[PDB]
Write a protein that binds this ligand. Structure first.
Ligand SMILES: CCCCCCCCCCCCO[C@@H]1O[C@H](CO)[C@@H](O[C@H]2O[C@H](CO)[C@@H](O)[C@H](O)[C@H]2O)[C@H](O)[C@H]1O
Ligand SMILES: CCCCCCCCCCCC
Ligand SMILES: CCCCCCCCCC
Ligand SMILES: CCCCCCCCCC
Lengths: 48, 49, 48, 48
């Protein structure tokens, strides 16, 4: 929790890549794209 | 506290390295066993006639 | 004598490292601490 | 004085390394002990 309140935030605000609004990794090439789609589709099923 | 260390990433890294250094040194001086001393202690009285 | 001996360099090595780390946190800089740490010899020359 | 010292700069870094080498020399030459023998106003004589 101390790591998640001190180090983790500091890294997230320095060494994380900017994501464009709407991008949920559904356009990612290869397997990660399929998995991202499967999860987005499964999240919709779950919430319903 | 979170907002404090977002502006101060070096301070955040410093705390992490000191915690790791202390841990690395502790690994060298730490005893090694299968279990702790959990079994109940016993005292035997030996006599001969 | 056979038990341990010459444990000073090992502990003054981490003493240096930890002092540098604490200074880096004070100034929020990996470089500025050196400007403070370079006065160590100025006091040792007088003692010797 | 310092105002002119910060203009020269490179002269005192050569002077600094001399002090470290001078310190380094004295440290090696100076013999090492633990605790000095104190006069305690008492001593003993063995006869064998
Ligand atoms: C004593 C053992 C050895 C350790 C010495 C370290 C401590 C230094 C003691 C104080 C000496 C101060 O000496 C100071 O030097 C600087 C730099 O040369 C001089 O500065 C002079 O030369 C510089 C360039 O070299 C010019 O730009 C400047 O206009 C001129 O004034 C000062 O006029 C002088 O006051
Ligand atoms: C300005 C932040 C620099 C990030 C790099 C820090 C890496 C430190 C790793 C030390 C591990 C022992
Ligand atoms: C983790 C996704 C779980 C979604 C279940 C949806 C069930 C659909 C009706 C049988
Ligand atoms: C003791 C190990 C950590 C040393 C500090 C490294 C800082 C890198 C800044 C670019």
């Amino acid at each position: 929790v101390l790591v998640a309140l001190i180090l983790t935030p500091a890294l997230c605000a320095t060494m994380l890549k900017p994501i464009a609004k709407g991008d949920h990794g559904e356009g990612k090439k290869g397997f990660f794209g399929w998995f991202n789609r499967m999860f987005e589709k499964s999240t919709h099923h779950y919430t319903d | 506290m979170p907002n404090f260390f977002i502006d101060r990433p070096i301070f955040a890294w410093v705390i992490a390295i000191i915690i790791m250094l202390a841990g690395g040194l502790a690994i060298l001086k730490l005893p090694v066993a299968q279990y702790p001393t959990f079994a109940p202690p016993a005292v035997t009285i030996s006599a001969s006639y | 004598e056979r038990l341990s001996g010459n444990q000073a360099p090992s502990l003054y090595a981490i003493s240096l490292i930890v002092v540098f780390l604490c200074l880096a946190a004070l100034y929020e800089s990996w470089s500025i601490p050196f400007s403070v740490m370079l006065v160590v010899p100025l006091g040792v020359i007088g003692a010797l | 004085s310092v105002g002119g010292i910060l203009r020269s700069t490179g002269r005192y870094l050569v002077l600094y390394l001399i002090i470290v080498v001078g310190m380094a020399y004295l440290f090696v030459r100076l013999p090492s002990s633990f605790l000095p023998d104190e006069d305690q106003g008492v001593f003993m004589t063995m006869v064998q």
